[PDB]
Amino acid sequence: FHSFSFYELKNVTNNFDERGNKMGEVVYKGYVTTVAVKKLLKQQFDQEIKVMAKCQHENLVELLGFSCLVYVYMPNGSLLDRLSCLDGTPPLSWHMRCKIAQGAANGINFLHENHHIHRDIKSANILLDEAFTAKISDFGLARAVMTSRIVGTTAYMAPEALRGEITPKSDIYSFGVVLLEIITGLPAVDEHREPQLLLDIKEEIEDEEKTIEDYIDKKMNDADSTSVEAMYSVASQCLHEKKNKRPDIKKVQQLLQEMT
Ligand SMILES: CC(=O)N1CCN([C@H]2CC[C@H](Nc3ncnn4ccc([C@H](C)CC(N)=O)c34)CC2)CC1
Is there an atom of ligand 1 within 6 Å of 61 CB? Answer: yes
Is there an atom of ligand 1 within 6 Å of 38 CB? Answer: yes
Pair (168, 61) in one structural domain: no
Give the residue from 111, 102, 76, 247 showing the smallest Cα distance to 178.
102
Based on the structure, what is the number of domains in the chain? 2
Pair (116, 152) in one structural domain: yes
Asked which of 57, 73, 89 is the last residue of a domain, the reply is 73
b/e sequence 146-180, b meaning 16+ C-beta within 10 Å: eeeeeebbebbbbebbeeebbbbbbbbbbbbbbbb
Pair (84, 213) in one structural domain: yes
> Please, how many CA atoms are within 13 Å of residue 244, restricted to the half-sphere of its CB?
0
**Can you list the positions of beta strands (E) in 21-68?**
22-24, 27-28, 35-38, 63-66
Q: What angle do CA 89, 154, 37 make, to 5 degrees?
A: 50
Is there an atom of ligand 1 within 6 Å of 96 CB? Answer: no
Between the CA of residue 239 and those of 22, 70, 113, 202, 243, what are the distances in Å? Answer: 35, 34, 21, 8, 9
User: Amino acid letter at 125?
Assistant: N
Closest residue to atom 6 of ligand 1, CA basis:
23
Pair (98, 156) in one structural domain: yes
Q: Which of 120, 129, 171, 217 is catalytic?
A: 120
CATH code, domain carrying 189: 1.10.510.10
Pair (69, 82) in one structural domain: no
Closest residue to atom 26 of ligand 1, CA basis:
125
Q: Which domain holds residue 193?
A: 74-260
ω into 195 cis (within 30 of 0): yes
Give the residue from 186, 260, 187, 198 showing the smallest Cα distance to 228.
260
- Please tell me what resolution, in angstroms, this structure has: 2.1
Asked which of 42, 73, 104 is the last residue of a domain, the reply is 73
171 classed as catalytic: no
Pair (29, 141) in one structural domain: no
Burial class (CB in 10 A: 0-12, 13-18, 19+), 7: exposed
Asked which of 38, 54, 73 is the last residue of a domain, the reply is 73
Atom of ligand 1 nearest to the CA of 72: 18
In sequence order, what are the beta bridge partners of 134?
A: 128
DSSP run (H or E) holding 135:
strand 134-136
What is the C-alpha separation between 217 and 92, in angstroms, rounded? Answer: 10
Pair (80, 68) in one structural domain: no
Pair (88, 142) in one structural domain: yes
> Please, how many CA atoms are within 13 Å of residue 216, restricted to the half-sphere of its CB?
19
Pair (126, 111) in one structural domain: yes
For residue 223, the Cα-to-chain-centroid distance in whole angstroms is: 22
Pair (65, 175) in one structural domain: no
Pair (66, 78) in one structural domain: no
Pair (133, 143) in one structural domain: yes
